[PDB]
């Protein structure tokens, strides 16, 4: 097979193929997640320079890995399908041998391992993808939110954003997220999430997806209207 | 040892060209003119048998090859690339078809097989594209007579008539002028012998011209009798003599 | 220059620069000395630490009861090579019930080193080895270079400033070659030779490593308090 | 250009520069020779004594293949060793299938094709040795010399290394002055002289002589090293002629 | 293992499956659920070789669950049965074939029809109104041939099953320790907890 | 390019020397060895206030008598840890005994030069492996991507290392109690750390023959931090 | 058909005292009704103060003893000349034996 | 060794783009335009051949529109020979699905696998990507009518109407302008031809320079018919919309 | 400039490595020639032994491929031997598989096909040789077929190869223009051999002694080479003529 070491060290101590994979993540549409008291909300930008799209059938940005865990990402889309597929298989394999679904920490650790392996295997380039993985461990009501990046490092977040202009929205989240007081309901948590995307997005038109995940495999996607009501209510308060 | 070349040698340039297919086509351009004309009841493929020395025996260098008893081919470009393709084309006709269905493949499919081989030389690790363009003329029961052109990229097109190689632009316009949809095979042979004369500089006779037809079934050419449904090959190579008779009433 | 991208390229004068750079790594390595009489063969090695808080990298490795080596240069490579040698000794024992001749140990290392200098992808080993042994034809000392070249010697030294010891031994040749039936003198003569290679520091107790094999001595290693006797 | 940075690339001359560069490594080595005689062949080589610490008689350079073939080489010593190992495998395989020990012409081509094979790809390096070898088979005696390119021929005498030109001259003399045949014991002496003569081009360092031979009458066809009194005798005959 | 039956009535599919797990001269367990849920409206019962049955069942289950997640869609009972048959048909020509017989009872939400499939370890598949694997059939097929009707209510179905299980308890030589009964209908899968 | 396995003309392996640059960029990690135990501490170095710092794991258990701290590209250590744990548990299965700290370390270092044209590049992480065995007692080792390991009485690795190492050269004596060392690690960490040291952006652990390898709670470390502030004010 | 096993007879015995242990075997080696050797020892010193005997099919026993002696050698090589404790030796021998679970060493082993 | 001659087809530019995918897309933009328009009662595929000669045999020809199965077809822009490699892959995959589940492959599942293959060539194996972009047009009883596209990167998206190949930027604006959701096939047929007419780089649009197909449920009752247009039918539809 | 180092197309559609391999063809500075009799095919090549230390009997570029096929190589010996061993192996296998002796033209095609491959696949360099195969084929009669590094092959009335190939070629064309036939109209091979050396001398303008030449003859059922003494006898006859 094709042998070449594509991920190697440079004299300053950097691995440029990994670092350039982050650049692709940087170019991807924004993604964000905020954990409430009793829920985790994943929200995603969808780029608007593309009308004539069919949204019943175009790949949705948040993906179910199991019935209790979800994954969103920023970066190369085709790359993300590979990580999603592997994670879903790992999820089913885990249930089979342990007789219990994956913890969010474990499933994160898996995806992260896959990503890292592609940074010191010959003949492969790293994944141009960073992920947000969110959900609730089986029989547990504490929300979880983790982030991965092409290097294979992963960690837990009270809230976090990846993709283009994710810096601007981390700014917003850093000044608007009280660790002492996390959004005490769904309603509030969704609100903070849409607010932060509206720092970067546009009209809150067909430009924002929101998924809400709750304890015991309770996941639901919001519709245009539902999202719109949040966008409407946010700007009316803005004339102040 | 072994192939350490497991990466493609044909890649996209920033302008979108595939350098090596382009260059292979350049090589075909320098090749000697060959052509094909489709008649209502036949096909003719013809080319110039340009020689190596007067000491070579050019009957041994056959540029027009039988693939199946109803398909023939001819080319322009690098002759040795052609030679191995004719070997591979004949085999795939058996392996991937006749051995499965008990009959020879139809022209379009065999062409597709050949084209597939040529495409792989355009993407696999550590090879260059083939430096030929082929013209394949065949007949099958449900499709009738056909003529195809296969390029180094693996692309193929069906033609009423065309020419490839050296003086092909000249040849193609000459053909446009005299091709109609009622040409009887003998007429198509006439036109081909005329079109080839333009591009042939030296001697022009039955020894300097290779030419073959996909026409009527040839029962005298079958080798055996007693099966009424086996009627003989439709491919026939014209003899040195047969070409010359046609050249007197030119 | 343009001819040092890998081991599979000859320079225009006929040199293999990757081999030569491997040879260079030996030169940076700490000094070690070999010498032998007709009854024993001794290794003396100066060890190197990282700083005042660290250990002193061991340089002597045992290969069989009757054989062993000392290393100068890349330590992991000496492990790969000593481990290989341990097998070859082991294979000779198990299959033939025969202790592996030291001369053969030489040929086997040479041939192993050479493979890594003629194929794309590889790199030469970056360590120099001194093999001592006592076999069916007496005491022996060998110098291995990762060029593949192996030579039998009465004595020699490799590493940084090994030249001092290497002249000293050349001078003392006829004295030490006849320290037969005496361990502690062949060692003394070794410790003296390795002294010709020191600068701004001399031999302490957790700094000097000494090995001996011969007629009625299994290859054994002395360290720490067992070598204070010789400082 | 850049035609010399990769083995098996043709230059526009038509040459493969990496093989030519390998030769430079060979030309750089010590001298070795072969003399074919009445019923055998003789090999000898120059062993530079770099220091007083080298054990004499104890760094043997001539190698045997099977029971009847001698090989000697100049250049990169471990490459030559590698080549003999292949030769040894080739000889073992031949004898296993055919019973008879491998003929010397047959043996030459085994090494020939294997060395040639290392001029065929960019992922191996050509051999950095010239190899003189030969022995006695059912068709008499044979001496051969093989280069990095894989080229080889039959020889009356042969020489390679730093003293090759000098040695060659001396050899042509012997071929002219003995048109009927040099004897086995005669040729041993001659080899001693010629290594001594061709040591001139390498004289800073002094050396150790090493000789070996196969003779149908003197060794019964087998390869033996010349040692003891017979070696001293030729070390002497050589001392004479260099004064 | 041993006893597994299924009846498709008007609106639902009912699977009954014996509870004993016998090994040698000991009944090791008398409450064994010889079933897996492959998707919300598809249930598979199984009987056969020790180890093979559960290993096969769970393997299928995981595969179907993987399909459900990937496509966010429930496969039809017809498709799941066809997948399962193929798996078994591969297995029969393996180095070691699975020795497992299955009944797949599902409710097709696109057609609103109950569907029952009988598939043996060779990969023989048949759609039936009522099925049985092993020796059970030798008693129950004739009894169902008589009393079964295609329009029966789930209620009538269960009584028709009681009849089967009684006949089996009368004439079968072994003690199969009763059945666990489940109903697959438009509202998924539930287990009758008193039989 | 040129071979991944190439030597420089100085006689060093490029890719190894470069992986050493990556390690210098890693967060600090320090180990101190006493006759009462070995102590491991790391700088967590959270990249933003939203990141939950207890999810940062740079101190890891290999066996109950062996612990590990890391510095550099920490995703690279997952597989080294995995190898270590398997080696430890495997050795125990074959021999019904605890695996020696030097042996484990050698096993881990064996992986390290396994790369080229085996993995595609060396590791971008260095490890401090701290343990106890009944043969050589309390031991601390520095495991580099070069395949080489050194035993240390104390050692620091990462960005704070050259400064921190000199400091350790001064403070370390052969009769430090464990408590002294805990404080000594906290002290040197706070010195070299970018942000102000507290019980969230640093973590402590030790391994004693009695209770094995333990990572400390934040409560436990928070008070050792207080104790160190007080002791330094008081002279 | 070829039967790869055979019985070389003999018997062995081991008793443990408070600060000592013994391993005894007879020195006769037989096949069928024939004596092969009247003195062919089958109890061995394996180093690190372990004595071993693998009685049964001599070829299998000799192989096991050979392999274990080598195990002791490599244990020193790999673990800084550490002494192999009897409990460790025994576990390591279990693995040698069970490694041929499906083509067994035909021997009763005692250390 | 051979490393010196290796393009490294699967690497990242400093900006984080895949050079070869980028260049393959630039390559595709010189290919004949293809258009897909999805109506409430069917789907239209329309494509412009690469500049045809007069001697070319127009009726025993395919270059642009291929059949995957009875419910799905594609329109090709890029290398015809690359395209065929992927088409026979796609056809097979459709047949394994039918054979496994005894149901026809849902359109997206087929599209995803084909796109995953493409993605493969951009992350490992050091070969050049496929120089092909696809418009998938097909029907299944889960989503009804569907239009997708995929490109050399392995990325795919669903559409109401879309173009690939040459002048897609022009062609897309014109579709964006005149498309509406309630639209019927014959309107879509009209839009398609009008768009190609305006974006063609040729003098006028003629039947011999076009491939055309419709996927309707306009056979008999709740089942789906594919129609690859013969050259006579294309000439008629071109007069019948007053383009000639 | 790497489109010159491996076997890929240059922008003008050329393969430089193949062209450079043709230049290595002449690098031994030897000329060869072959002609057909009625009964035979004769091949002669120059023999140049420059070193006095070489054993002249081992210096050859003519090979006996099978009992019926001979082959003379123009090019470096190591590539030449490589080609010879392969053709011997290929010709032996063909007999085994198909039950009849491999024809000259078929072996030529086979060796040309292998040669083609090195011009397409990049890890293999072309061999720097031209192979001239000769037999008296049991079907086609006396046969001359020739291969080059381009992978090209064709049959000949007669041919020549080497540095002075064109002179020998025209010299030969001119003979056949005259004679008006396809071969040397001669009963014995001895006189066809004589013809061959004669037209070699006139074309090169040099005289040959018995050790400046090398001759191979193919008749029905055997191909053999000549000794210095068989050649001597042949030269003698030409002199007294």
Compute the distance between CA of residue D45 and CA of residue B187 in angstroms, rounded to an integer: 82
Of the candidates A196, A47, C147, which has an alpha carbon nearest to the alpha carbon of residue D76? C147
Chain H residue numbers touching D5 (CB-CB < 8 A): 4
H99/E86 CB distance under 8 A: yes
**Residue with the two structure tokens 């699977």:** E15
Of the candidates H8, H2, H3, which has an alpha carbon nearest to the alpha carbon of residue H126? H8
- Of E59, E69, E72, which is closest to A66 when you measure between CB atoms? E69
Q: In CATH, what number is assigned to the domain containing residue A173?
A: 3.60.20.10
Chain C residue numbers touching D82 (CB-CB < 8 A): 111, 114-115, 118
Determine the number of helices (DSSP H) and then strands (DSSP E) in chain G: 2, 7
H2 touches I at CB < 8 Å: yes
Which tokens go with E103? 């009944």
D123 touches H at CB < 8 Å: yes
Of the candidates H28, H32, H52, H34, which has an alpha carbon nearest to the alpha carbon of residue H193? H34
I123/H2 CB distance under 8 A: yes
Q: Which residues contact D123 (CB under 8 A, 6 or more apart)?
A: B1, B2, B4, C8, C119, C120, C121, D7, H1, H2, I123
Compute the distance between CA of residue I50 and CA of residue I46 in angstroms, rounded to an integer: 12
Of the candidates E101, E107, E121, which has an alpha carbon nearest to the alpha carbon of residue E17? E101
What SS3 state is found at B188?
A: helix
Looking at the 3D structure of chain C, how many domains does it have?
1
Return the residue in G62, G73, G82 with the most chain C beta carbons within 10 A, the one to mutate for interface testing: G73
Neighbouring subunits of G (3+ Cβ pairs under 8 A): C, F
- For residue E85, the distance in angstroms to the closest alpha carbon of chain H comes to 9
Compute the distance between CA of residue C4 and CA of residue G93 in angstroms, rounded to an integer: 51
- Of D11, D15, D150, which is closest to I78 when you measure between CB atoms? D150
The structure was resolved experimentally with: X-ray
Q: What value does the CA radius of gyration of chain C take, rounded to a whole number of Å?
A: 18
B4 touches A at CB < 8 Å: yes
State the residue range of the domain holding B214. 1-250
Per the CB < 8 A criterion, the answer to whether F117 and A122 are in contact is yes
Superfamily of domain F1-235: Aminohydrolase, N-terminal nucleophile (Ntn) domain (3.60.20.10)
F234 touches A at CB < 8 Å: no
What is the 3-state secondary structure of chain C? CCCCCCCCCCCCCCCCHHHHHHHHHHHHCCCEEEEECCCEEEEEEECCECCCCECECCCEEEEECCEEEEEEECHHHHHHHHHHHHHHHHHHHHHHCCCCCHHHHHHHHHHHHHHCCCECCCCCCCEEEEEEEEECCEEEEEEECCCCCEEEECEEEECCCHHHHHHHHHHHHHHHCCCCCCHHHHHHHHHHHHHCCCCCCCCCCCCEEEEEEECCEEEEEECCHHHHCCC
- Of H100, H103, H109, which is closest to E86 when you measure between CB atoms? H100
List residues bridging with D71 in a β-sheet: D63, D133
> How many CB pairs (< 8 A) connect C and D?
97
**Buried residues in B189-222 as b, exposed as e (16+ CB within 10 A):** bbbbbebbeebbeeebebebbbbbbbbeeeeeee
Compute the distance between CA of residue H13 and CA of residue G68 in angstroms, rounded to an integer: 57
Compute the distance between CA of residue B44 and CA of residue C65 in angstroms, rounded to an integer: 85
Compute the distance between CA of residue G45 and CA of residue G24 in angstroms, rounded to an integer: 12
**DSSP codes, A152-165:** S-EEEBSEEEESTT
C228 touches H at CB < 8 Å: no
Return the residue in A62, A91, A92, A95 with the most chain E beta carbons within 10 A, the one to mutate for interface testing: A92
Among all residues of D, which ones are annotated catalytic?
30
Q: In CATH, what number is assigned to the domain containing residue I228?
A: 3.60.20.10
**How is chain E split into domains, by residue range?**
1-195
- What is each CA distance from H233 to H48, H211, H241, in whole angstroms? 16, 10, 12
Chains E and G touch (3+ CB pairs under 8 A): no
Looking at the 3D structure of chain B, how many domains does it have?
1
Chains F and A touch (3+ CB pairs under 8 A): yes
- Of I9, I14, I116, which is closest to B80 when you measure between CB atoms? I116
> How many CB pairs (< 8 A) connect C and F?
81
Q: Which residues contact A148 (CB under 8 A, 6 or more apart)?
A: A108, A111, A112, A115, A130, A131, A133, A154
H101 touches B at CB < 8 Å: no
Helix axes A104-117, F77-95, angle to 10 degrees: 100
Give the containing element (helix H, strand E) for F41.
strand F37-43
**DSSP codes, chain A:** ------S---TTS--HHHHHHHHHHHHSPPEEEEE-SS-EEEEEE--SS-TTB-TTTS--SSEEEETTEEEEEEE-HHHHHHHHHHHHHHHHHHHHHHSSPPPHHHHHHHHHHHHHHTTSSTTBPPPSEEEEEEE--TT--S-EEEEE-TTS-EEEBSEEEESTTHHHHHHHHHHH--SSS--SSHHHHHHHHHHHHTTTSSSSSTTEEEEEEETTTEEEEPPHHHHHHHHHHHHHHH--
B4/A3 CB distance under 8 A: yes
Quick one: CA dihedral H82, H83, H88, H92, positive or negative? positive
Of the candidates G53, G54, G110, G46, which has an alpha carbon nearest to the alpha carbon of residue G84? G46
In order of start, what are the domains of chain D with their CATH numbers?
Answer: 1-243 (3.60.20.10)
- Of E71, E82, E110, which is closest to H102 when you measure between CB atoms? E82
F110 touches G at CB < 8 Å: no
F5/C4 CB distance under 8 A: no
Please give the resolution of this entry in Å, rounded to 1 decimal. Answer: 3.0
State the residue range of the domain holding A82. 1-240
What SS3 state is found at F217?
A: coil
Chain D residue numbers touching B2 (CB-CB < 8 A): 123
Per the CB < 8 A criterion, the answer to whether C211 and C60 are in contact is yes
List residues bridging with I120 in a β-sheet: none
- What is each CA distance from A40 to A34, A71, A190, A225, E72, in whole angstroms? 6, 12, 9, 21, 21
Q: In CATH, what number is assigned to the domain containing residue C148?
A: 3.60.20.10
Compute the distance between CA of residue C183 and CA of residue C172 in angstroms, rounded to an integer: 17
- What is each CA distance from D74 to C124, D69, D135, F76, in whole angstroms? 22, 17, 19, 48
- For residue G82, the distance in angstroms to the closest alpha carbon of chain F comes to 8
Compute the distance between CA of residue A201 and CA of residue A210 in angstroms, rounded to an integer: 13
**DSSP codes, E117-158:** EEE-TT--EEE-SEEEEGGGHHHHHHHHHHH--TT--HHHHH
Neighbouring subunits of F (3+ Cβ pairs under 8 A): A, C, G
Per the CB < 8 A criterion, the answer to whether F63 and F99 are in contact is yes
Looking at the 3D structure of chain A, how many domains does it have?
1
Compute the distance between CA of residue F194 and CA of residue C142 in angstroms, rounded to an integer: 53
**Chain H residues 125-184 with CB within 8 Å of chain B:** 126-129, 131
Determine the number of helices (DSSP H) and then strands (DSSP E) in chain E: 4, 12
Chain E residue numbers touching H100 (CB-CB < 8 A): 82-83, 86
**How is chain F split into domains, by residue range?**
1-235
Of the candidates A125, A170, A133, which has an alpha carbon nearest to the alpha carbon of residue A151? A125
D2/I24 CB distance under 8 A: no
Per the CB < 8 A criterion, the answer to whether H214 and H137 are in contact is no
I122/H4 CB distance under 8 A: no
Q: Which residues contact F144 (CB under 8 A, 6 or more apart)?
A: F20, F23, F112, F126
Chains H and C touch (3+ CB pairs under 8 A): yes
Q: Which residue is closest to D125 within chain H, CA to CA?
A: H1
E110 touches H at CB < 8 Å: yes
Strands (E), I30-155: 32-36, 41-46, 62-64, 70-74, 130-137, 141-147, 153-155
Chain A residue numbers touching F76 (CB-CB < 8 A): 116, 120, 152
E23 touches A at CB < 8 Å: no
DSSP state of H97: H
DSSP state of D149: T
Which tokens go with F167? 């400091």
F96/G87 CB distance under 8 A: yes
Compute the distance between CA of residue F18 and CA of residue F4 in angstroms, rounded to an integer: 11
Which tokens go with C112? 């192993």
H162 touches A at CB < 8 Å: yes
Helix axes G86-98, G58-78, angle to 10 degrees: 130
- Of D120, D152, D172, which is closest to I52 when you measure between CB atoms? D172
H5/I123 CB distance under 8 A: no
Per the CB < 8 A criterion, the answer to whether H35 and H163 are in contact is yes
State the residue range of the domain holding I100. 1-241
Per the CB < 8 A criterion, the answer to whether H192 and H214 are in contact is no
Q: Which residues contact I22 (CB under 8 A, 6 or more apart)?
A: D14, I128, I148, I149, I150
Which residue blocks in chain B are alpha helix, DSSP H?
19-30, 79-93, 99-101, 107-120, 168-178, 185-199, 240-248
Compute the distance between CA of residue E148 and CA of residue E161 in angstroms, rounded to an integer: 10
**Chain B residues 86-145 with CB within 8 Å of chain I:** 87, 121, 126-131
B250 touches D at CB < 8 Å: no
Chain centre to alpha carbon of residue G72 = 13
Compute the distance between CA of residue H17 and CA of residue A21 in angstroms, rounded to an integer: 9
C2 touches H at CB < 8 Å: no
Chain F residue numbers touching G78 (CB-CB < 8 A): 103
Q: In CATH, what number is assigned to the domain containing residue H2?
A: 3.60.20.10
Compute the distance between CA of residue I146 and CA of residue G101 in angstroms, rounded to an integer: 64
State the residue range of the domain holding H24. 1-244
**Residue with the two structure tokens 């096969």:** E56
Q: In CATH, what number is assigned to the domain containing residue B79?
A: 3.60.20.10
State the residue range of the domain holding C78. 1-231
CB-based burial label for C58 (10 Å; 0-12, 13-18, 19+): middle
- For residue I114, the distance in angstroms to the closest alpha carbon of chain H comes to 22
Compute the distance between CA of residue D45 and CA of residue D29 in angstroms, rounded to an integer: 11
Compute the distance between CA of residue B40 and CA of residue B33 in angstroms, rounded to an integer: 24
Compute the distance between CA of residue A21 and CA of residue A83 in angstroms, rounded to an integer: 15
C120 touches H at CB < 8 Å: yes
Q: Which residues contact E24 (CB under 8 A, 6 or more apart)?
A: none
Chain F residue numbers touching C18 (CB-CB < 8 A): 6-7
Superfamily of domain E1-195: Aminohydrolase, N-terminal nucleophile (Ntn) domain (3.60.20.10)
A157/F15 CB distance under 8 A: no
Return the residue in A7, A50, A78, A149 with the most chain H beta carbons within 10 A, the one to mutate for interface testing: A78
């Amino acid at each position: 097979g094709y042998d070449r070491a594509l991920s190697i060290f440079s004299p300053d101590g950097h691995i440029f193929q990994v670092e350039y994979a982050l650049e692709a993540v940087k170019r991807g549409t924004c993604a964000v997640g905020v954990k409430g008291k009793n829920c985790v909300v994943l929200g995603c930008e969808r780029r608007s320079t593309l009308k004539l799209q069919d949204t019943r059938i175009t790949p949705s940005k948040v993906s179910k890995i199991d019935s209790h865990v979800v994954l969103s990402f920023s970066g190369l889309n085709a790359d993300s399908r590979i990580l999603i597929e592997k994670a879903r298989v790992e999820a089913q394999s885990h249930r089979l041998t342990l007789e219990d679904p994956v913890t969010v920490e474990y499933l994160t650790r898996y995806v992260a391992g896959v990503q890292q392996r592609y940074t010191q295997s010959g003949g492969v380039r790293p994944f141009g993808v960073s992920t947000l993985i969110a959900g609730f461990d089986p029989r547990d009501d504490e929300p979880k939110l983790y982030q991965t990046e092409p290097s294979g490092i992963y960690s837990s977040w009270s809230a976090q954003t990846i993709g283009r202009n994710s810096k601007t929205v981390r700014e917003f989240l850093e000044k608007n997220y009280d660790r002492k007081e996390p959004p005490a309901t769904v309603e509030e948590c969704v609100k903070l999430t849409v607010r932060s995307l509206l720092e970067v997005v546009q009209t809150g038109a067909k430009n924002i997806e929101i998924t809400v995940v709750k304890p015991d495999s309770d996941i639901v996607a919001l519709s245009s209207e539902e999202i719109n009501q949040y966008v409407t209510q946010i700007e009316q308060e803005k004339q102040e | 040892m072994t192939d350490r070349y497991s990466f493609s040698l044909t890649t996209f340039s920033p302008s979108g060209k595939l350098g090596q297919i382009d260059y292979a086509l350049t090589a075909v351009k320098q090749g000697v003119t060959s052509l094909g004309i489709k008649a209502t009841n036949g096909v003719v493929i013809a080319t110039e048998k340009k020689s190596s020395s007067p000491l070579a025996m050019s009957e041994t260098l056959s540029k027009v090859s039988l693939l199946t008893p109803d398909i023939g081919a001819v080319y322009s470009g690098m002759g040795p690339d052609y030679r191995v393709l004719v070997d591979k084309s004949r085999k795939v006709a058996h392996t991937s078809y006749k051995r499965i269905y008990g009959e020879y493949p139809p022209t379009k499919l065999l062409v597709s097989e050949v084209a597939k081989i040529m495409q792989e030389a355009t993407q696999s690790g550590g090879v260059r594209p083939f430096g030929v363009s082929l013209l394949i003329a065949g007949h099958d029961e449900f499709n009738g007579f056909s003529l195809y052109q296969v390029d180094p990229s693996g692309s193929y097109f069906p033609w009423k008539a065309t020419a490839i190689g050296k003086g092909s632009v000249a040849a193609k316009t000459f053909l446009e002028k005299r091709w109609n949809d009622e040409l009887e095979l003998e007429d198509a042979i006439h036109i081909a012998l005329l079109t080839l004369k333009e591009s042939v500089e030296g001697e022009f006779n039955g020894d300097t011209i290779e030419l073959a037809i996909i026409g009527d079934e040839n029962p005298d050419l079958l080798g055996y009798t007693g099966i009424p449904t086996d009627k003989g090959p439709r491919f026939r190579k014209l003899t040195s003599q047969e070409i010359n008779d046609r050249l007197e009433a030119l | 220059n343009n001819y040092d991208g890998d081991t599979v390229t000859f320079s225009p004068t006929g040199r293999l620069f990757q081999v030569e750079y491997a040879l260079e790594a030996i030169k940076q390595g700490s000094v070690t000395v070999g010498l032998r009489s007709n009854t024993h063969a001794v290794l003396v090695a100066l060890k190197r630490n990282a700083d005042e808080l660290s250990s002193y990298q061991k340089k002597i490795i045992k290969c069989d009861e009757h054989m062993g080596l000392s290393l100068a240069g890349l330590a992991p490579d000496a492990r790969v090579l000593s481990n290989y040698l341990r097998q070859q000794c082991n294979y000779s024992s198990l299959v033939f019930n025969r202790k592996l001749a030291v001369e053969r140990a030489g040929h086997l290392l040479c041939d192993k080193a050479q493979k890594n200098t003629q194929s794309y992808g590889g790199r030469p080993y970056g360590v120099g080895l001194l093999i001592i042994g006592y076999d069916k034809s007496g005491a022996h000392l060998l110098e291995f270079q990762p060029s593949g070249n192996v030579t039998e010697l009465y004595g020699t030294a490799i590493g940084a400033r090994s030249q001092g010891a290497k002249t000293y031994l050349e001078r003392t040749l006829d004295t030490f070659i006849k320290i037969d039936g005496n361990p502690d003198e062949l060692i003394k003569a070794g410790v003296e030779a390795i002294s010709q290679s020191l600068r701004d520091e001399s031999l302490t107790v957790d700094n000097l490593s000494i090995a001996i094999v011969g007629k009625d001595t299994p290859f054994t290693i002395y360290d720490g308090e067992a070598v204070a006797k010789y400082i | 250009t850049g035609y010399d940075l990769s083995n098996s690339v043709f230059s526009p001359d038509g040459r493969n520069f990496q093989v030519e560069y390998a030769v430079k490594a060979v030309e750089n080595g010590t001298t070795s020779i072969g003399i074919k005689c009445n019923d055998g062949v003789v090999f000898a080589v120059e062993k530079l004594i770099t220091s007083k610490l080298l054990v004499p008689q104890k760094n043997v350079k001539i190698q045997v293949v099977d029971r009847h073939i001698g090989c000697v080489y100049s250049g990169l010593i471990p490459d030559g060793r590698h080549l003999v190992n292949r030769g040894r495998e080739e000889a073992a395989s031949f004898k296993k299938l055919y019973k008879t020990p491998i003929p010397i012409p047959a043996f030459a081509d085994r090494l020939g094709q294997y060395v040639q094979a290392h001029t065929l790809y960019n992922s191996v390096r050509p051999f950095g040795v010239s190899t003189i070898f030969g022995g006695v088979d059912k068709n008499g005696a044979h001496l051969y010399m093989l280069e990095p390119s894989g080229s080889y021929w039959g020889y009356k005498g042969a020489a390679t290394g730093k003293g090759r030109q000098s040695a060659k001259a001396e050899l042509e003399k012997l071929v002219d002055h003995h048109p009927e045949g040099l004897s086995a014991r005669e040729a041993v002496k001659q080899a001693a002289k010629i290594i001594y003569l061709a040591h001139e081009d390498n004289k800073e360092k002094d050396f150790e002589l090493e000789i070996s031979w196969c003779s149908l009458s003197e060794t019964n066809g087998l390869h033996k090293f010349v040692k003891g009194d017979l070696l001293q005798e030729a070390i002497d005959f050589a001392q004479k002629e260099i004064n | 293992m041993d006893i597994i039956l299924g009846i498709r009535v008007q609106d639902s599919v009912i699977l009954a499956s014996s509870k004993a797990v016998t090994r040698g001269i000991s009944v090791l367990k008398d409450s064994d659920d010889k079933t897996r849920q492959l998707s919300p409206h598809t249930l598979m019962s199984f009987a056969g070789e020790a180890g093979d049955t559960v290993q096969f069942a769970e393997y299928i289950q995981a595969n179907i669950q993987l399909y459900s997640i990937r496509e966010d869609y429930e496969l039809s009972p017809q498709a799941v049965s066809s997948f399962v048959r193929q798996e078994l048909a591969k297995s029969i020509r393996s180095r070691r074939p699975y020795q497992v017989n299955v009944l797949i009872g599902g409710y097709d939400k696109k057609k609103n029809k109950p569907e029952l499939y009988q598939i043996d370890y060779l990969g023989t598949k048949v759609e039936l109104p009522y099925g049985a694997h092993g020796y059970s059939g030798f008693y129950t097929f004739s009894l169902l041939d008589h009393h079964y009707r295609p329009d029966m209510t789930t209620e009538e179905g269960l009584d028709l099953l009681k009849l089967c299980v009684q006949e089996l308890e009368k004439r079968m030589p072994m003690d199969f320790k009763g059945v666990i009964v489940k109903i697959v209908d438009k509202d998924g899968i539930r287990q009758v907890d008193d039989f | 390019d040129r071979g991944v396995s190439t030597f420089s003309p100085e006689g060093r392996l490029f890719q190894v020397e470069y992986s050493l640059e990556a390690i210098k960029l890693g967060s600090t990690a320090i180990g101190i060895a006493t006759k009462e135990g070995v102590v491991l501490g790391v700088e967590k170095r959270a990249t933003s206030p939203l990141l939950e710092s207890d999810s940062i794991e740079k101190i890891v258990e290999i066996d109950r008598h062996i612990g590990c701290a890391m510095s550099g590209l920490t995703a690279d250590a997952r597989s080294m840890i995995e190898h270590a744990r398997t080696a430890a548990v495997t050795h125990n299965l074959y021999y019904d005994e605890d695996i020696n700290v030097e042996s484990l370390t050698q096993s881990v270092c064996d992986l390290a030069l396994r790369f080229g044209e085996l993995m595609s590049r060396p590791f971008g992480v260095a490890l401090l492996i701290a343990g106890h065995d009944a043969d050589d007692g309390y031991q601390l080792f520095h495991a580099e991507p070069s395949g080489t390991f050194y035993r240390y009485n104390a050692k620091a690795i990462g960005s704070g290392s050259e400064g921190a190492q000199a400091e350790l050269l001064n403070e370390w004596h052969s009769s430090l109690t464990l408590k002294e060392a805990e404080l000594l690690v906290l002290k040197i960490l706070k010195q070299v750390m970018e942000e102000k040291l507290d019980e969230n952006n640093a973590q402590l652990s030790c391994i004693t023959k009695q209770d094995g390898f333990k990572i400390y709670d934040n409560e436990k470390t928070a008070e050792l931090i207080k104790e160190l502030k007080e002791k330094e004010a008081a002279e | 058909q070829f039967n790869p096993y055979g019985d070389n007879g003999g018997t062995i015995l081991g008793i443990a005292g408070e600060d000592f242990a013994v391993l005894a075997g007879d020195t006769r080696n037989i096949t069928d009704y024939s004596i092969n050797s009247r003195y062919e020892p089958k109890v061995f010193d394996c180093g690190d103060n372990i004595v071993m005997s693998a009685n049964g099919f001599a070829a299998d026993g000799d192989a096991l003893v050979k392999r274990f002696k080598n195990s002791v050698k490599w244990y020193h090589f790999d673990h800084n000349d550490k002494k192999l404790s009897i409990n460790s030796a025994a576990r390591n021998i279990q693995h040698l034996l069970y490694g041929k679970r499906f083509f067994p060493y035909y021997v009763h082993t005692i250390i | 060794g051979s490393r010196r001659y290796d393009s490294r087809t699967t690497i990242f530019s400093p900006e984080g783009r895949l050079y070869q995918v980028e260049y393959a897309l630039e390559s595709i933009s010189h290919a004949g335009t293809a258009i897909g328009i999805m109506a409430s009662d069917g789907i239209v595929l329309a494509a412009e051949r690469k500049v045809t000669s007069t001697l070319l045999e127009q009726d025993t020809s395919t270059e642009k529109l291929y059949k995957l199965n009875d419910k799905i077809a594609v329109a090709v822009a890029g290398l015809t020979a690359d395209a065929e490699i992927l088409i026979n892959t796609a056809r097979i995959h459709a047949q394994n699905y039918l054979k496994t589940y005894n149901e026809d492959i849902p359109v997206e599942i087929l599209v995803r696998r084909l796109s995953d293959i493409k993605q493969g060539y951009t992350q490992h194996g050091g070969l050049r990507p496929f120089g092909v972009s696809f418009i998938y047009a097909g029907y299944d009883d889960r989503y009804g009518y569907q239009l997708y596209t995929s490109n050399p990167s392995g990325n795919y998206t669903g559409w109401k109407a879309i173009s690939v190949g040459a002048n897609t930027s022009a062609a897309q604006t014109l579709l964006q302008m005149d498309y509406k959701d309630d639209m019927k096939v014959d309107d879509a047929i009209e839009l398609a031809l009008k768009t190609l007419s305006k974006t063609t780089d040729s003098s006028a649009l003629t039947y011999d320079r076009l491939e055309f197909a419709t996927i309707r449920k306009g056979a008999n009752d709740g089942e789906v018919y594919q129609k690859i247009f013969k050259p006579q039918e294309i000439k008629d539809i071109l007069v019948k919309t007053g383009i000639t | 400039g790497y489109d010159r180092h491996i076997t890929i197309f240059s922008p003008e559609g050329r393969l430089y490595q193949v062209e450079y391999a043709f230049k290595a063809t002449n690098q031994t500075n030897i000329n060869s020639l072959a002609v057909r009799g009625k009964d035979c095919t004769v091949v002669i090549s120059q023999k140049k032994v420059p070193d006095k230390l070489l054993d002249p009997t081992t210096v050859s570029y003519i090979f006996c491929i099978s009992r019926t096929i001979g082959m003379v190589v123009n090019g470096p010996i190591p590539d030449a031997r490589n080609a010879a061993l392969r053709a011997k192996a290929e010709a032996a296998e063909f007999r085994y598989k198909y039950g009849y002796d491999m024809p000259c033209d078929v072996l030529a095609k086979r060796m040309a096909n292998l040669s083609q491959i090195y011009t397409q696949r990049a890890y293999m360099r072309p061999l720097g040789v031209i192979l001239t195969f000769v037999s008296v084929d049991e079907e086609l009669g006396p046969s001359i077929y020739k291969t080059d590094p381009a992978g090209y092959y064709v049959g000949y009335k007669a041919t020549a190869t080497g540095p002075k190939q064109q002179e020998i070629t025209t010299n030969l064309e001119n003979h056949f223009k005259k004679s008006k036939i396809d071969h040397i109209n001669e009963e014995s091979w001895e006189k066809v051999v004589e013809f061959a050396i004669t037209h070699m001398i006139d074309a090169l303008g040099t005289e040959f002694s018995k050790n400046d030449l090398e001759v191979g003859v193919a008749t029905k059922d055997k191909f053999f080479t000549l000794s210095a003494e068989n050649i001597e006898e042949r030269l003698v006859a030409i002199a007294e003529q």
